[model samples]
Target: AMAPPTLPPYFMKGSIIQLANGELKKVEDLKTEDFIQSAEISNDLKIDSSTVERIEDSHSPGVAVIQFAVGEHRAQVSVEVLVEYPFFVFGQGWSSCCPERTSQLFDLPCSKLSVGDVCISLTLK
Candidate 1:
């Protein structure tokens, strides 16, 4: 038997870029060991090469910093949930449990979330 759906799929609008290795990755998915290729930050600016330094997620909008040949550059890369739609946000290795409670019920941890877990969202305005 299949379990009944308890919650709707959560989604958000996000940005991503291609890496030097010809792989597409979301900004949040980047790690310290990742290498970034030349990326155009603006109409007249571009980065020659960079290696991920660290990720900052303490703020409302997270950012990723990279060490480049010139220096370090930080990019404002993050996503926000559109107010019109209800959503749930979770970082990598995040998990959530149901509200069910019972003395006789076995207390098991919520399933671990995977790196590829995702939901799609589109906005038309």
Candidate 2:
């Protein structure tokens, strides 16, 4: 009777951060295992996933690397979104699914964004 919201599946300005023991918890406090462990789809995406796709070389221009679990808490956390493409440099010709006007969707802005679904051990500052 209330499925019109489509759940918490909204992309674009995607962001999530948590770093217990070192400080920096969010993403609703995390639990299941925490999420986000790497994101940087730009810079040519040279390929370096934290030790074979676990996330390890992100400059943090918009950082998004939390990594799974959203109930019992885990580790690692740093999801940020600071879009500055300025609406596609003033053309806006790629709103694929709408993310407010298009950004290709995913973690978004945060360096291009990705790696959001691991479920624990988000380890990384």
Candidate 3:
């Protein structure tokens, strides 16, 4: 038998990156200028490019919560965002559990745009 999995300390309900023209700013493309540098996704969720740290002979596990936000109000949505960096370590291609081509660029891991929303989340189990 297997034991139940442990949950993360907290979860983020929004994007940690800055929004330019209503689009998320790339983590690598972010610089100190007009951006606030960090935004609280949730009381417990806060992430940014600078938050990323390097570990030696150790690994950290967590999930990024992505959500789609529309004007006035956004629809309820859920999905798993694909990873790009860890690919070099995982030795695999960027993959997402979200339905293919349903939402986002080339069905990318952003959010379901067709639903006319601006919120998505990647909860790491």
Candidate 4:
């Protein structure tokens, strides 16, 4: 038995990027040379701004809402899927769960996430 076919490396186009200087940009509106606040992740995490590196073009793999249930309650986040046949929008981490680079999802895709874990959370500076 397998976990079925589910995994890739990217964020939704609607996902917003909060830059180091307190500016926000959409994924589609960003470029290869753009600099922004990023993270230096480890067992200890910290923010360190960096360039956009490269942008790869991809098509829609549909939208997914990653949610966590707290007893009878649910909290969620949405993203447009761009897996397998498209860009590698990963940041840095082991796909089992958790990351640092972006300190959001790391290099791990949403579908690859394991249960009972925590990721980073910070507002723009």
Q: Candidate 1, which segments miss by more than 4 Å at Cα? A: 1-13, 36-125
Tens digit per residue, CA lDDT, model 4, 1-125: 11223454345425776655556776545432333133332323343222222223335333232333322123343332322212212242222222232234332232233333332333233
Please give the ranking of all candidate structures by lDDT, highest first, separated by commas: 4, 2, 1, 3
lDDT of each: 0.28, 0.29, 0.27, 0.34
Estimate TM-scores for all models: 0.21, 0.18, 0.17, 0.25
Tell me the spans in candidate 4 whose CA falls farther than 4 Å from its real position.
1-6, 9-11, 36-125
For each of the candidates, the C-alpha root-mean-square deviation to the true structure, in angstroms, is 15.0, 16.2, 15.6, 13.7
- List residue ranges in candidate 2 displaced over 4 A: 1-6, 24-103, 108-125
In model 2, state the lDDT of residue 3: 43
* True-vs-predicted CA distance for residue 116, candidate 1, Å: 31
**How much RMSD separates candidate 2 from the native structure?**
16.2
| Superposed Cα deviation of residue 77, candidate 1 (Å) | 22
Q: Residue 90 CA error for candidate 2 (Å)? A: 40
Candidate 2 positional error at 116, Å: 17
* TM-score comparison, 1 vs 2, better candidate: 1
